[PDB]
Amino acid sequence: GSSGSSGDAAKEGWLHFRPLVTDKGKRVGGSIRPWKQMYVVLRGHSLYLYKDKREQTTPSEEEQPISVNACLIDISYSETKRKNVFRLTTSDCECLFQAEDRDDMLAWIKTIQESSNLNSGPSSG
């Protein structure tokens, strides 16, 4: 699916990004911030978040990009009042992602899981 779908991002849409931790050499007592709502865009193998949908062409503003090339998605536990939420863990850091409609959620999980996974698809012919 190349040279067709407009844009340069596999998928895009508003989602709640809740990181588990960013630092390692720091002893903190509790998460730094709760569920954050920022436009999340998937371009290639990196996740570019945005506090607003004013402009995508440009990179993030304050939140650094996260690599998903080797991440691990898993339907977040079914305990959080938040429904249709998938948990993603990148070799660099870990975070969460919520959705609106189940159908929509599944879409993301797939799209991403497809990017991270080996791109050894049939590119012959």
Curated annotation (Swiss-Prot):
Induction notes from the record: Up-regulated upon cell differentiation.
Subunit and interaction comment: Interacts with GTP-bound ARF1 and ARF6. Interacts with CTNNA1.
Residue ranges of every copy of the PH domain listed in the record: 8-117
Tissue: Widely expressed with higher expression in brain, heart, skeletal muscle and placenta.
Subcellular location(s) per record: Golgi apparatus membrane; Cell junction; Cytoplasmic vesicle membrane; Cytoplasm, Cytoskeleton
Protein name as catalogued: Rho GTPase-activating protein 21
Function: Functions as a GTPase-activating protein (GAP) for RHOA and CDC42. Downstream partner of ARF1 which may control Golgi apparatus structure and function. Also required for CTNNA1 recruitment to adherens junctions.
Post-translational modification: Sumoylated with SUMO2 and SUMO3 in proliferating lymphocytes.
